[PDB]
Structure formats: C-alpha cells, structure tokens
Subunit: 393 residues, 4 copies
C-alpha cells in the first residue's frame, strides 16, 4: 500500500499542577501546537484533512475539545476534527488513527496529538439532576475518577504500580534510583538547550501587562539526589514502594504532529522527519496496566520486523518507575537508549497529551544524534498499551 | 483496497429522559449491544481485535468508557478499546474508524458503535480546586455545555436550527408537518413490529422482584396530530419556529455493529448484512451545523460513484425538523425513502449513540425490503457531518 | 411584676416533607401566622414592640429570618425582630423570651413563635472557600447536621431515642400502640373540626388555575392500624425499637402567639386566651435528650405551685414514641389528658415551629373544653427541655 | 427586680479573614470566652442558669452553636443554652436577653455574648434536595447572603452605607479621615497594651512546632495615613464613597460577659464591673440600617434618664465610617469620648460577636480611666439598632 510519514512535531512545555498552564484550557494548548506544527511543516490550515486530538478529562470542556483546538488554531470550519480517549494512550493513538486513515485513503493530511489540563479538571456532582432527598452527597474529583482510577478494581493507578512492583520484584531502592536518573537526565538536557527546538511557547495573560511566554518544563527538579527520595513515605499503600518522587506528576500540556503519506510529502516538496514504520496496541489485566508497553512494543517490533536490539532510541513513558523498570526488565533492551533526555517522572505526565509529547521528544533527539530507528510506547489505565516505531533514512 | 462488511447490528430501545434507562450507566448500555452484536454475528469475544464506542458525556464516567463496555460485555482484557467524541457523529464515526483500521491492516474484527445516558449526566463545579474566596459560583450542567451548546457562538444547538430554518426558508408549519410524519411513521413501525429484530432488551432491576425487559422506544408519541403541535410555543427563541415537538429529545441508548473484511467474513462462513460502500466527514460553519449531512453525503456518494437517486433507503438523523428539512431540500432525494420507520423526533437522540442507532435501523429495514443501496448521515454540533453508504448484494 | 397573657394563637397546617408547603420559605409561613395572630388579637402591626421567631435551619435563608417574616406580615420597619435557635425548643422558648421581656418592662406587645421549612433545607459545602486541591469533598445535608444530629456523640436524634427506650424500658410494642393512638386521635380531631379555628390557610400557587388553600394536616395517616406498624424495620439501628411509624417526620409549618401583660390587654379591651402561669428550661445529657421535658415540666409545675395531677390538658411533643412514653412514665400524670387531638407522630414536626405549634393546639382545646390548667413541653436535641404552663380563669 | 450587673468580660483577639482563627469553629471561640469570663468572675460552671450566644452564620455548624460553646467550655449538661441571630446586634442583644431573664426571675446567672467565624462560612446549594433537572445551578456564599446582604432591597450592606452618606452629607473625605483616626487609635492602644487585660489567648495548633498563642488584633493596620486611603476605588458603587479602608472587614472572634442581679453578686462576694443602667432596641428602614444606633441610643438614654452629654465613654460600632459619622452627627455627643482605643474599621467586625466585643472593650476602658457612664451601640442589617448603657459607682 502506502507509507505514512511525519513532517513536523511540536509540544508545549509541560506545566506543574496548579502551575503556569493551569488557567489555559486544554483546547487552547492544543491550538498552540496544531498551529506551530503546521507552520513548521509548511502546510496551510486549509490543506488539512482532519484533526484528531486526545483529551481524557473533558467534564465541562464544551463540545468536542479537538474541534475547539482546530478552530482556535486558525483552521477553517471545513476541516473536521474528533476527540479521542484511550487514557494515557490517547496522544499516541491519535497518530495511529491518522495513519490508518491515510492508509485507507480516507484522509490526506492529519494533525494528530493530545492536549490535557489536569489542573483545571473540575469536581463533579453525580446524581445532581435528580437531587439529594436526605443525606450527604459526594463531590468527586474528575481528575481522579476519569483519569487515575481503575474501574474494575476500584483503586488508584499507583496501586497497579504496586502490583507490578511486587510481580516483577521492583524494589523501592531501584525505583528511587530510576527516578533520580530521570531527573538528572532531564536537568542535563534542559540545561544544555536540548528541549529548545521542540517546545513552542504558550503566552500567559498578565492582569495589566503584556503576556509572558511559558516555555520551560517547570516540573523538572534540578540538583535532585537519591537522598531527597530514599526518605519519603509511600504515596498509595503504607507498606508500599511507590512515592511522589518515583511516580510522575499531575501536569498540563499538549503536543502534535503533522502526518501524511510519503507520496503526498513528495508532491508538496516536504522533507519528512521520519517514516512511521509500524504501530500496535495491546490489552493486559487492569491490575498490571503498567505492563501494556511490553506486548504493545513486541507487536510493534514484530510488525516492523525489528528486534529490540535494532532500536537506536526509545521513549517509554514513566507513569511510575515501578512499571517503567518492569517493562525494561521484560523487554531486555538497552536502557542507556531509553528516555535519554529524562522522562515523565521529571518532565510531567499530562495524561491525554503524553503519548504525543514523548513522540515529539523522540523525534527531535533522533535527529540530533542521527538515530535511525526509534520507538515510543506508553501504558494505559484499564490495562492497555500502545507503541509506535519510526524510521529515519 | 480491501472491502469492509458489517456482519451484525444491535441496538437498545431508546429511553426517555429520566425514563427506563436513566439509572443504567452508558457503558452498561454499550455492553448489552456489544455482547448481542457478537452473538448475532457468531463471533466469540476472544476473536475481537478492538472495540470503538462513542460517548459524548463522560464526566464522572470513570476511565475509558468504551473499555468499560467491552469488559462488561464479557470481552477479555487482551481486547483493546477506545472512546471517541465527535458529538452526534460519534456512533457512526466509530464505524468509519473501524473500516479505516481494517483497510490499513491494523485490525481484523472491530465492534463499533456508541452509547449515551443523558439522564445521568451530572453538574460540574469549575474552579473547585482553587476554591471560591467570596461570592457565588456556578454549577454547570454537563449535558448542556458538553452535548448541546455551541462553543463558538455560545448558544444552544436549537439556535443553530433556527439559523438553518431562516436560511433555507423552513417554516414552522413545514417543521410541524415533518415532525408529525416522523411520529406517525414510528407509531406504524412499532405497531407492526418492525423494530422487533434490531432491538435487544435491557433488563431493568425491580426492587423485590424479577428484572423487567425494556424493549420499546418509549419516547415515541402514538396518535400525534398537527393540532397537538401547532399551538406550542417556540423552545429556544421567542420569535422562532423550533419547539419541543419538532425537535428531538434528550435520551439514553446504545448501538453496535461488528465489522470485518469481506475476506474474513468469507473465511468465517459469515454472510454479511452489507458491504460498506463509502463514507465521508465534512465541516461547515458551526452556526448552521444542521447542514453537515449535505457535504458529508455528497462526498460519500461521490466516493461511491452513486447519485442521490441511486439510493433505495436513507437514514438521516432528525436532531431538528428544521435541519432535516433543509438537508432534504438541498440533496433533492426522495423523502419517501428516508426514515421510513420514523426518526429521532419520535425515537429520541442519545447523542453519542445516534450515529450507530440509525445505522442499525437502516440495515434491518434494508434487509426486510431487499433494498440494495443505503446511506446514513447525521449533523454534528460545532459544524460537521458524517455519512456512510452501504450496499447489499 | 406582672401577669403575662396570651391574647391570640395561630398556626399553619403542617406540611409533609416535599408536600404542600415545600416551596414556601419559612419566613413567609411565619408571616402568615404573625399577620393572622395580630388580626385575631385585635392588635395592629404598629403596636407591636418586638417579633421573636424560632427557626433552626437558616442556611441561605437571608439576613435574620424573624425580621423577614415580620416585614412580610406587614409590620413596619420600626418593629424589631430577632431569630432564635434552641432546636425543637425554639418555638416555645420564643414565648418564654417574650414573657421575660414584658415582665422586665422591656417590651409591651410581643409576637412570638417559630417557623420551619425542612423540605427546603439545602446542602452545604464546607471548605468551599479554600477549595479542594485533590480528592473528593462532602456536600453536607443541613437538615440533618443542623437539625437532627447530636454534636457530642455524632449520631442521629433517633439513636438518643433508642438510648431512652433502653434506659427506661420502653418496648417496641408500647411504642407502636402509642403511635397508632396518635394517628387515630388526629384523624378523630380532623373529623370533629378540632383544628378549624387554629389553622390559617396558606394559598398555594398551582400550575393551572387559582391558588389552592392549604389548610389540613396532610401528614396525618387516616385509618392507621397496629398491623401497619408492628411489622416495619427499625429506622436507625438494626437492634432498635424506633421506626418510621413510631417517630414523627420531617415537616414544614409555622405558629405564633401574641403576648402582652394582663394590664395591657385590659387597657386595650382585649380578652386573653390564657394567662402564662410559669415556664422553665432544663438540661440533660445529650445521650438522653428525649427526657428534657421531665426536669423542665417539674420545674414549671414547681414554679406554678401545681402538681402533675392539677393539669387538665397537656401537649408533650412526640418526636419519638420512645421518649414521649418515658416522659409519661417519669412524670406519673394521666396520659389520657395528653395530646388529646393527636401529636407530632401524626401531625408532623417542623422543628423550629413545633414548640409554638403545640401551644396553639393546647390553647384552642382548653377553650373548647373550658379546661383550666394546661402545660406544653418539648425535648431538645443536645440535651434540653422547655415547658410552659397556662391557666384560664 | 434589683439592678442587673456585669461581673466579668472577656474577648478573643479579632482575626483577619482567612487569618489566625480561620480554622477554629465559632463555638470553640465561644468556649474560650465563656470559660474565661466565668474564671474572671469567680463563678463555677455549674452555678450558670443559662448561656446565650449570638451567631449569625450557622450553615453546617451543627445543632445549637451556643450549646456547643457551653459544653466545650466545660459547663455541665444541666446548663441550658440558646443561639440567637439579630445579625450584628446578636452579641449585645444576648446581654439584653440575659438582663430581661434575671429581672423576670427566670435565671440567676447568665453568660452572654457572641461568636463568629466568617472565614469558615461555607457555600450552600439551594434546591439540592430537589435536584436540577436542566440548567446551571448556583452555589451561594452564606457569608454574603446570611450575613451581608439586604433581603428587601437585594444589595450589600455597603449600599446602605452609601444611602446614609448621601442622606446625611458624609463625604468621602470625612470617611477616610474617621477611618485613619480609628486605625491610629487602635495602633496606640496596641503599643500601650490597653487590650492586654480583656483579650484571652486562643492556642493555634502549628503542625510544625508547639501551638502559638493568638492574642493580638491582627486586622489593625499600624502606620495608617490619609494618603493610603484617599485614592482607593469605591468598593460597592462606582459613584460611591465607601471603600475597603473606610469600612470594617470580614472577621473572626468571640466575646462574653457574665451577668447576674446585684443581690446575687453580693451574696457571692463578687465585685461588679458595672451595673446595667438601661438598654433598648429600635427599627429603621433597611435602606438606612446604619442609623439604627440613633433611635436605639436615644431610647436607652431616655430609660436611663441620661442625656448624651452625661456619657463619659462610648463604643459605637464602626461597620462603615459613613454610618458611624451620621450616627455621631445626629446624637451630638463628644466623639473624642467614642471608641478611644480604636474601632471595627481597625479591629474588625465578626458580626455575631461584635455587639459583645465592643461591650468588653467599653467596660475595660471605663475601669482604666474611672469613667462612670458608658454606652455601647451598633447597627443591624435589615434596619435595626441596639444600645446598652452601663454605670460604675
């Protein structure tokens, strides 16, 4: 059939919970990256066939957050858009959907990624429409129930990370060591300007002044040490191993890529960043959802006819050190090539955006080191994984 | 390219607002129809490659509503699922994504549809994290803001219907006539048992008694007359034309179809209900979103190399009589072949499910009258349409 | 100092929970009875020195509910008013404060009573001003927390009634005979027109035609039998004696009397309903709050130099059969003189009003029988009692 | 009826909105002053006949806040208590009711005052019991609606201040100058230690450390100048005179006095702080509620047979400089004898407590300077005033 290529890539910086992006709605972050990614590609808004954006947390967001991002980015009304939710998989699954559509001949050019503002997620009042005839009622945190809580077992994602830690023998000390590594890798990449090219600024309005650009991954902890972690108390289970320091955060951000067939890029005179080599999803038991990247990455590698050793660089999302370590244990690949600029423990985890955020990061680093074969993969609440492989000439 | 077929199709009856389905969460509705479509197909749950369900209103619904439906339907954890939101387009867009993934080689068997419980939609409290230092605060109705309110113009979907009525000269009296036709057609279909085959029952628990089977479209008003409608006051604009009787309702329901390649159905010994001939989306100005089906249906017909006159049967969703009538005026096709068993004014409009609900109704009627060429289409809040054409041997 | 007289008495009928008064704010109910009590007394609004109304549930009620009722009853701005809260004692305590003011020469004519709309009580959101940075938050039922919940032991008034039943050996059977007696006596009183004179109609706006006059104690169960109660489940504790049928309900209503010195009444040419003989409060352990009426009634009788046997008629509130029966047990008086027209189990218990409601009922029955000596008393959540004795010449 | 005397007086320091007392519920503030006032007087908890506490904002506070203060202060269950609401009049009115009760013979020893935590007042959800079938709902601020908002005119207390400013010609300049005066007087009293004796410390738990003694009027702004006020935006009306600096604030605190007959204090060997000479209430138009102290103070002076010139010392509450100035203009009294240690503009205005707070301040300063004739008065939302005159031998 047809090869799919990525012609451009952009992300916002990732905001801390209640931080610099907390008052900017997720679609407005999405618009920043859709607009930037098209500019970078040299593609006019009217040439876009569709926009697909992941967003998990949509309570009170208004009709179709992806359409809002597309319109706010300047795209004309003739360009249709769809919002998707595959939890942390969303941002990457959008690119997968774009590739399916191009391959099927349903679309020519697709802007795909994800957008999330966890800070702005509201509380919801279940049963409000009916009323509360007697007795107390509950205001439920949508960020938790819709973003972070397993339906089937009724406990937090952090408990799934405890389950994975026990199953694969991932100790508290190894978690913390992995977490310090991520922070120091991120600090080192940040301090050396390595995130400069991939980040586009978001202008934050200021009461009686000009807006200020936000363009730094403010969640990254500089000068992080093992000692600053090894004393912390477990966050989710009193006898447990997972802490605030060895899990990712609650974060805000967006990321997008522009996708088209290789034949279309050549028709337009565009040199692609990379070819999409393969992609795959996978399902696992919700109890061990952090393991999804294993069967997903294995399926993606098999579709690519690659081995884990053929890879030059990977981005494997760090929702929890416990799960990222188990994944590395089970894949057997070389971890000096994974998250070389740090991961989500340091950078943050805006759930519906991360899938494309890590792809953006992967592509920019590949180019910088002239890596030829890369993979991005993430675990997914409710027991899934997605993985996508890219190849450079 | 690979031909994609639909091998089975099932819907719940549509519940009234606060009616028989009001306490059954949308993913339980989806489960009922996923499970029945697979039974009807003769496809085991472990054969399924992916589930894709639309659901618009997801506040407090828990992680990834489509996964919830899949798991509740008895599908194993290895089967991935994803939720989508293209407003009222969702349930039909789901089927489109399924066909894309089959044609691309990404999936083999997909269960695709939509699910919605508008009755259960809650209120949300924006700003609840920060708190309310002084003064009052708004509890926002998610059904309205997320389902029924245009972002760009900040008014109800009903005003977009008034815009269309004005633009296209659709009178109050023409709307009411249409609406009475739809109710009378739905009444005739009910009395004749036309919906018996497509409807699968939902068992409604009863306090100290056996569950009761809900299996009838309880929103349908039997004995509807013009005099019952022509006296009502307009619902959205005091000088307008759109009333509660010539617009659809707020409703609960779900619908699903099982999709696979023609080669796969042959291998499995399955006789399809139909082949998917073509499909398309479209964008239009949000102010006239009701017109979405015109460019969508023209693109789908074009892709099929059919003309409007080639069609034997259509299902064009009746969000508002005003928009359904403008769509017919612009397409110029034979309206005696449209919504022959009634439409949403009568049956209801569970937004995230409607696009698959109408597909289910189309396919069952096509089979009963031996129609060969069909089309389903819907408008979409924010200014879009989708359309899908099917063909039977 | 002075003899204090009651010149007039009026009450609304008592509304069922969510029933006929549920949409009428408490001060508007209080306005009804203040206006009516003054017309019945022959006292014009500008002669009033003060208005004192009990209201327990005042969340979102607006500034000073008693002043609202006074203004709404047509009293001029020059007449001050005060709201009080002694839980169920409130409505009677108002009368006691009125009589103190008069005896001290602080006031001349006082309208005193209480008003309550339990149906309209809202939920509150504690911590709302600081916000809920992460996690679920509680909407607290003000009816329960402010009206019905013991602060010190953190359980329902119904558990205090279980405590009383156990300590004084009041059995489930005793309680149910008491409760059926109350229903039957109320039904007989309604048939005899006993409440025709005391009740002031409240006009209730209707969907269609003219407002309907609400003027009947609609909570009273006609044709109640022992068999309808002896089989029910306990309402507050598995091992309990207290049920929905042997406790009163959640109710709406108001009541007021007009109070002044005997000398002021003769100077104005008015004939009193009765003279206030004495009154008292008392405190008991919160655990057995239902016994409050014992030390309160003993103190009032002692202040009157009367014996329990001197009484012709008593109104002793029946929040719970369990506590009313223990009160009777400890006082030793003839229970056939008590609540002769039925009590709160049948009529209902609008908490801030009930203390004057029962006095109103007492005074009208005393007149009709030409009884000479009476007493009203109530228990009070948090461990108190109030009692007040009246004499007719 | 003998004279009534005040044997002791105690208050907390006044907290700023969201300040040092913010997390201490009102009845706990109440408890501090009840216990202290009894200790100062030499009265054992079990000798108390009744506790009477003002508290305006009671939404979710639990049953009978006055009783809660009494029990928390260590008074036995046998001591009855009552909460009252006459808005800002509440705390002085409680003393008035205590005096009426002693004169009447009803009580012997009464603890009276008020308590308020405005910081902690929650939001309420009106109609929550019935639910919100469609459309947005409103969370309402109970501080504003129950404490600060005029029922009849539907506007803030600040607007009643603007009414008084216009009607009595009280300029923006005159108001800023008065306000600078109050702040400067309070500053000097803090440096001098004039409040040392009246204030009782409240221990604020620290999380990190031992609990800190809160014992200073932390709202007082030291170094206040005319220049810091004279350019501020009006806070309530655009064409207005009232600002955040010439009005008091939103505050937390409690105060109580112990009251008994002169004969009783002699029997117990107790030296009064003062004799209650007289007291009065009054009503005015809600629109001009700030003038309430005029007729209340004239009525109280009249019952005392005093003239305004007879007074050695006054405490007239400063809700708004606009009304305090109008009150002084109408009474004609010596303003250098009013609020000599500063007033509410500086000290703060915890509404249900302020009427006792100013009395506590009055009594301590009267003793310090050997003043013989004193008076305390405040305005009341909804159009009222209260005044109480005291006399030292």
């Amino acid at each position: 059939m047809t090869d799919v290529v990525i012609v451009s890539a952009a992300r916002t910086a990732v905001g801390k919970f209640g931080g610099s992006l907390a008052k900017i709605p997720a679609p407005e972050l999405g618009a920043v990256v859709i607009k930037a990614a098209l500019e970078r590609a040299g593609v006019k808004p009217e040439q876009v066939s569709e926009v697909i954006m992941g967003q998990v947390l949509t309570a009170g967001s208004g009709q179709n957050p992806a359409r809002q991002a597309a319109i706010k980015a300047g795209l004309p009304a003739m360009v249709p858009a769809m919002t998707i939710n595959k939890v942390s998989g969303s941002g990457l699954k959008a690119v997968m959907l774009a590739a399916n559509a191009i391959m099927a001949g349903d679309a020519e050019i697709v802007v795909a990624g994800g957008q999330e503002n966890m800070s702005a997620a509201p509380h919801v009042l279940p049963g409000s429409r009916d009323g509360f005839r007697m007795g107390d009622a509950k205001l439920v945190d949508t960020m938790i129930v819709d973003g972070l809580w397993d339906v089937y077992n009724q406990y937090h994602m952090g408990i799934t990370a405890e389950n994975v830690a026990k199953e694969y023998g991932i100790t508290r000390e190894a978690q913390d060591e992995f977490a310090v590594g991520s922070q120091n890798k991120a600090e080192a990449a940040q301090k050396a300007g390595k995130f400069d090219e991939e980040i586009v600024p978001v202008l934050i309005p200021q009461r009686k002044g000009d807006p200020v650009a936000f363009k730094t991954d403010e969640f990254v902890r500089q000068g992080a040490t093992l000692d600053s972690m090894s004393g912390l108390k477990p966050a989710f289970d009193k006898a447990g191993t997972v802490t605030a320091a060895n899990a990712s955060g609650l974060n805000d951000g967006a990321a997008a890529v522009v996708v088209m067939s290789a034949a279309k890029a050549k028709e337009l005179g565009l040199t692609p960043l990379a070819t999409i080599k393969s992609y795959a999803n996978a399902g696992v038991d919700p109890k061990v959802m952090g393991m999804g990247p294993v069967p997903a990455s294995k399926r993606a590698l098999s579709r690519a006819e690659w081995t884990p050793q053929d890879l030059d660089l990977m981005e494997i999302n760090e929702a929890f050190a416990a799960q990222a370590l188990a994944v590395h244990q089970q894949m057997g690949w070389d971890t000096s090539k994974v998250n070389v600029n740090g991961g989500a423990i340091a950078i943050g985890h805006p759930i519906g955006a991360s899938g494309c955020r890590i792809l953006v990061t992967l592509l920019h680093e590949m180019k910088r080191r002239d890596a030829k074969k890369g993979l991005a993969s993430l675990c997914i609440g409710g027991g899934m994984g997605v993985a996508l492989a890219v190849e450079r000439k």
